[PDB]
Design a binder for these strands. Sequence first.
RNA 1: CGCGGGGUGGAGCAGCCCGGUAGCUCGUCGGGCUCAUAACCCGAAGGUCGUCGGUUCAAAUCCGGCCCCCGCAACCA
RNA 2: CGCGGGGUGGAGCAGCCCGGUAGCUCGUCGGGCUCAUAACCCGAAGGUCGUCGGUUCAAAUCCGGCCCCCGCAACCA
RNA 3: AAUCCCCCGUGCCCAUAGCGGCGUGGAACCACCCGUUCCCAUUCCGAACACGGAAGUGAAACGCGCCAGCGCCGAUGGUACUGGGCGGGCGACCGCCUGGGAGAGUAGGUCGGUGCGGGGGA
RNA 4: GCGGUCGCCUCCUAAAAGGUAACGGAGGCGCCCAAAGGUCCCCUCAGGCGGGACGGAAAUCCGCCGGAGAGCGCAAGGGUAGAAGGGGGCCUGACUGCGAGGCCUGCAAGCCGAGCAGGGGCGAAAGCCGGGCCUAGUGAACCGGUGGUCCCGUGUGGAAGG
RNA 5: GCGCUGACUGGGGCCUGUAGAGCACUGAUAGGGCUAGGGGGCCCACCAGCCUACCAAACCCUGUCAAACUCCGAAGGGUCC
Lengths: 111, 181, 141, 45, 76, 66
Amino acid sequence: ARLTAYERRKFRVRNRIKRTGRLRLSVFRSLKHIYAQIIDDEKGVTLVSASSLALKLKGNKTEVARQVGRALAEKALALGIKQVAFDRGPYKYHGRVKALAEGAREGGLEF
Amino acid sequence: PLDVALKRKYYEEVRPELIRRFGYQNVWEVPRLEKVVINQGLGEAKEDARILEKAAQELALITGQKPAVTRAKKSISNFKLRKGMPIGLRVTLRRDRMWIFLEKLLNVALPRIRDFRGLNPNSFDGRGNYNLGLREQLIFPEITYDMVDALRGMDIAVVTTAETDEEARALLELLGFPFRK
Amino acid sequence: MLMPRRMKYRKQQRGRLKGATKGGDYVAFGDYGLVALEPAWITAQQIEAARVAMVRHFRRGGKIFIRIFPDKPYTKKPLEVRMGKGKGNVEGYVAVVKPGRVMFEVAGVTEEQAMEALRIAGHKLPIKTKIVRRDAYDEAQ
Amino acid sequence: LLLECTECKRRNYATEKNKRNTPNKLELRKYCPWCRKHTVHREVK
Amino acid sequence: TRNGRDSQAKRLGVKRYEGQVVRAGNILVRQRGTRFKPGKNVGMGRDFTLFALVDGVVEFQDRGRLGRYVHVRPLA
Amino acid sequence: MKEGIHPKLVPARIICGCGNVIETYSTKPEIYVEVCSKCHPFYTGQQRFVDTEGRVERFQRRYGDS
RNA sequence: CGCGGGGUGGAGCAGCCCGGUAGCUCGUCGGGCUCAUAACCCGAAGGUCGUCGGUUCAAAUCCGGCCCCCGCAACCA
RNA sequence: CGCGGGGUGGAGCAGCCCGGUAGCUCGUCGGGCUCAUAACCCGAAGGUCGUCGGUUCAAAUCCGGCCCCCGCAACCA
RNA sequence: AAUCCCCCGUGCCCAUAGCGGCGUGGAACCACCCGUUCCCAUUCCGAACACGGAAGUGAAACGCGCCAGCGCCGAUGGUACUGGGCGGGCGACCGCCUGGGAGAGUAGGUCGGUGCGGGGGA
RNA sequence: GCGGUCGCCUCCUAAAAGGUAACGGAGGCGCCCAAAGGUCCCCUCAGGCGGGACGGAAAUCCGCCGGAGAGCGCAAGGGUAGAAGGGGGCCUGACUGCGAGGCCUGCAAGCCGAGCAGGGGCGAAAGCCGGGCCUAGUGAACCGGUGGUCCCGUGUGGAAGG
RNA sequence: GCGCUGACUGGGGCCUGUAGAGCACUGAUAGGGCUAGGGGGCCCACCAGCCUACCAAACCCUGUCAAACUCCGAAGGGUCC
Ligand SMILES: [Mg+2]
Ligand SMILES: [Mg+2]
Ligand SMILES: [Mg+2]
Ligand SMILES: [Mg+2]
Ligand SMILES: [Mg+2]
Ligand SMILES: [Mg+2]
Ligand SMILES: [Mg+2]
Ligand SMILES: [Mg+2]
Ligand SMILES: [Mg+2]
Ligand SMILES: [Mg+2]
Ligand SMILES: [Mg+2]
Ligand SMILES: [Mg+2]
Ligand SMILES: [Mg+2]
Ligand SMILES: [Mg+2]
Ligand SMILES: [Mg+2]
Ligand SMILES: [Mg+2]
Ligand SMILES: [Mg+2]
Ligand SMILES: [Mg+2]
Ligand SMILES: [Mg+2]
Ligand SMILES: [Mg+2]
Ligand SMILES: [Mg+2]
Ligand SMILES: [Mg+2]
Ligand SMILES: [Mg+2]
Ligand SMILES: [Mg+2]
Ligand SMILES: [Mg+2]
Ligand SMILES: [Mg+2]
Ligand SMILES: [Mg+2]
Ligand SMILES: [Mg+2]
Ligand SMILES: [Mg+2]
Ligand SMILES: [Mg+2]
Ligand SMILES: [Mg+2]
Ligand SMILES: [Mg+2]
Ligand SMILES: [Mg+2]
Ligand SMILES: [Mg+2]
Ligand SMILES: [Mg+2]
Ligand SMILES: [Mg+2]
Ligand SMILES: [Mg+2]
Ligand SMILES: [Mg+2]
Ligand SMILES: [Mg+2]
Ligand SMILES: [Mg+2]
Ligand SMILES: [Mg+2]
Ligand SMILES: [Mg+2]
Ligand SMILES: [Mg+2]
Ligand SMILES: [Mg+2]
Ligand SMILES: [Mg+2]
Ligand SMILES: [Mg+2]
Ligand SMILES: [Mg+2]
Ligand SMILES: [Mg+2]
Ligand SMILES: [Mg+2]
Ligand SMILES: [Mg+2]
Ligand SMILES: [Mg+2]
Ligand SMILES: [Mg+2]
Ligand SMILES: [Mg+2]
Ligand SMILES: [Mg+2]
Ligand SMILES: [Mg+2]
Ligand SMILES: [Mg+2]
Ligand SMILES: [Mg+2]
Ligand SMILES: [Mg+2]
Ligand SMILES: [Mg+2]
Ligand SMILES: [Mg+2]
Ligand SMILES: [Mg+2]
Ligand SMILES: [Mg+2]
Ligand SMILES: [Mg+2]
């Protein structure tokens, strides 16, 4: 069994994003935590990091997400970065993935 | 409802007698039940959907789940059948709802089979899963004999986490499956 | 005589014969062989006459191999006609044979016997030939 | 079936093409006029 | 004879090679399938035709498993 | 499960050559089954009622002494 | 596209007028005369009467939209 | 080897356009009427569609090759 | 921040990183897991998707190692072919010079390498 | 002469850019689809083995194996699951006004096309959308028909006709 | 009229699928092996059923062929600097 709905859906949505040219607001979410990474392709380089497992916070992971959401803005917007795309990878734009995006407010956005 | 006599009997009877019989180092290694798939092959309903809904009516009554209506993958003349048309009925029941179903299958249904000296001890598909075919939908307690219009059986596919069917056999045995030895 | 059943295309160009035997080429079944010195189209009816000549001079045992096969469709007009209007028409099949190729090749027979058969067999061919035995070199695989 | 569907005033006639006997209804769909902007557009003649 | 037909040569192929200076618009490859894939600053039309999106120069990239790519690396 | 379009499925009763099967958990609580062969009636608890194997043996004994 | 007719049951087909029988033949079945089958006699089958909407108490009728088969008549860069 | 039409129960014909089911006459078989046969009456059996490949979900049917049949042509020279 | 080890992200190279066998890892990460109230769900199924949780397990997955049976890569020589320049044979074709030079096969090689960013270590 | 052919697409011939002939080797087009179109979200085949009432080589189901040999309306080729394939939800951009720049090219044609504007569709968004995986499904001009619209209206207002 | 841009040549990048070779796909194909089913030859006519001196799928070796086959692929050629 080569490649999986996971790996597939992952490329599918992520490949489209990488065409538009913008900086990528990649979102990896785990069972316990949710992390966020602003990457620049063609330079193969990350610019602004913002995890929850790095901000040692907890209590309802939909609300944690938004926090690490707003956390990403602050750190980033202070580096000039304003406009970006927003990955979303394998995750449907919903719950804590949608939450973090809604948190990414106070920083460029359009999402 | 998370009680169920068989779900209970698995953990506090089957699960231990299985460990001391195969010697599983880990907790998960020991065969768990998962997924029981019921599938009515219903070509009987080629050009008449009216008969396909009465069956679904029946299937959900015995399982507690409204089944999904499969459709013909390809067109195959000889016996009618084109790329479309509802040609089967299938429901996949999992944890809990599978337990309550599998319990009545052992303690009522099979008992009501004309004849019946045991299930086939060779229907294990090698990789540790078991399939069996029933010949009528009256052997289930929910059926009233006065709701039937015609007899139609089904396929039952029970799937196990056991890598071998040598083991998959014990699981089903200890659960109370009547095998013809 | 000897034609390849089921063909993707009947009638095929003619190409050249500048090659030097793709290979081949080194004997691989019998004790002795007939090797092609010149390039030519060998006709199924030429092969059949070479085979027979041997099985015949072998009492009936015998053990040919041939190794060449008529898969090329040879066409030819209906004569008494002029150029243009379709192509040849197919009147048989040939096998393409450049120098080096091992045709026929026999086994399970004496030397003064196999060598006499291969000589006969060779007279049925439109090219010059050569008889071989098969030494280490042949064991190229 | 060559088709020429129009708007709903001053005509218009931005022609398209419906091939068969189904679609066989009024064969209408939302389109845009050269005049104002985006109106119903129905099928005729 | 039952044969005798054929169609007009479609003059397909690459139109700008690597290290050639192009301009927004210049079509860079005419092809049937997706023999080449649109890279950086390279669009592709409904007939799979690759063209410069901006001015600059032409460079090719063989991403093996990922196929071959035509990029228009700017300079504008 | 999806809302509506479903049977209720509720704890139920049952009857047989046996006595009672509390387990159930099915639509239409309280059912009278012809013969639940699980309680112990039929084949299991290998009754082997109306035992057989006359065949040779039968014509044998009405023969040894006729 | 223009003008004129209409499809009635399994077939053609009267009822199309001054809005009111939704008919006749052959075919098949039942029954009798026939040494016989056909002829021939008795009875019986099948019509929302091309489409829908209308004006009248209705309607196959009249209007109107509608649909093709057939009918008619031109034109074709 | 030019062009056209064919090849289907035992005989002679349909069905091939347009796909999906093979029909008519004769004959054959069983039963009847007759002293008897035929006529006549009541029943029934029987064809993979020249052939190999292809197309399609499906080929007597559409497509291609080969083998036979019939018809027409072979002129200036 | 330096160096380094492990882990989670994300790239790049695009099989020497792959298949398969075996062995390992749960403190931390990750997964499975525990539930289905709530957002949201499955043409049936909380399998998937989704949320709320965390007792348990590294069985599955994944990560990391080892093994050349398969897969993959693969010279060096030597040929085939051939720019260009010359010969030869009735031909079909063949040979020389000077430059370029495969394919197969042989020896071998390989069960990864690395960029940026995190979390945890030393 | 008789026969065959005559435009368009695919493949080879074609000698590794393009192009290239013959009454050279083989096929196909003169359509089609209101969803077979746009967008968003999901989904992944063909086969092979084992397993399973009526199920048979093959109807529906379960298991493992299966990188594409399936599918993409029809020929062939190229392409393609990291979708162009399968499923659903809304929708009609099978838009109007244009068009940088090019492909091709004797002419005339044929082809691709970013971007701007108007007003929209789907999407959280990035964005995509000016029909369809693509390459055949086609016909200069003249002469007229039909619906608009400003424009001309033979002394002038109309009208005729353009 | 412009005027060093020309053929040709050196260096460098990119494009290609022929010569050759190859058999991984599409087909063709010699021998052997092992086995779907049939030719059979037959036991039955209830399972059956044994054997392969003709096939013959796939599968495995050893061998090969192809304008409309290519896992490969020169030399050359095209184009830009
Ligand atoms: Mg060789
Ligand atoms: Mg228009
Ligand atoms: Mg030509
Ligand atoms: Mg061409
Ligand atoms: Mg290359
Ligand atoms: Mg005839
Ligand atoms: Mg006849
Ligand atoms: Mg006819
Ligand atoms: Mg008769
Ligand atoms: Mg008789
Ligand atoms: Mg024929
Ligand atoms: Mg098809
Ligand atoms: Mg056939
Ligand atoms: Mg004359
Ligand atoms: Mg990682
Ligand atoms: Mg490779
Ligand atoms: Mg491995
Ligand atoms: Mg361990
Ligand atoms: Mg492991
Ligand atoms: Mg622990
Ligand atoms: Mg712990
Ligand atoms: Mg493990
Ligand atoms: Mg892990
Ligand atoms: Mg090598
Ligand atoms: Mg070398
Ligand atoms: Mg080499
Ligand atoms: Mg090693
Ligand atoms: Mg660190
Ligand atoms: Mg003529
Ligand atoms: Mg060329
Ligand atoms: Mg399968
Ligand atoms: Mg199977
Ligand atoms: Mg099976
Ligand atoms: Mg394909
Ligand atoms: Mg195709
Ligand atoms: Mg193709
Ligand atoms: Mg292809
Ligand atoms: Mg779709
Ligand atoms: Mg849609
Ligand atoms: Mg232009
Ligand atoms: Mg055109
Ligand atoms: Mg198209
Ligand atoms: Mg004129
Ligand atoms: Mg005019
Ligand atoms: Mg005009
Ligand atoms: Mg005026
Ligand atoms: Mg005047
Ligand atoms: Mg006036
Ligand atoms: Mg006018
Ligand atoms: Mg006017
Ligand atoms: Mg100069
Ligand atoms: Mg030059
Ligand atoms: Mg140069
Ligand atoms: Mg290549
Ligand atoms: Mg060659
Ligand atoms: Mg091959
Ligand atoms: Mg083959
Ligand atoms: Mg063989
Ligand atoms: Mg070749
Ligand atoms: Mg080709
Ligand atoms: Mg290589
Ligand atoms: Mg050059
Ligand atoms: Mg160069």
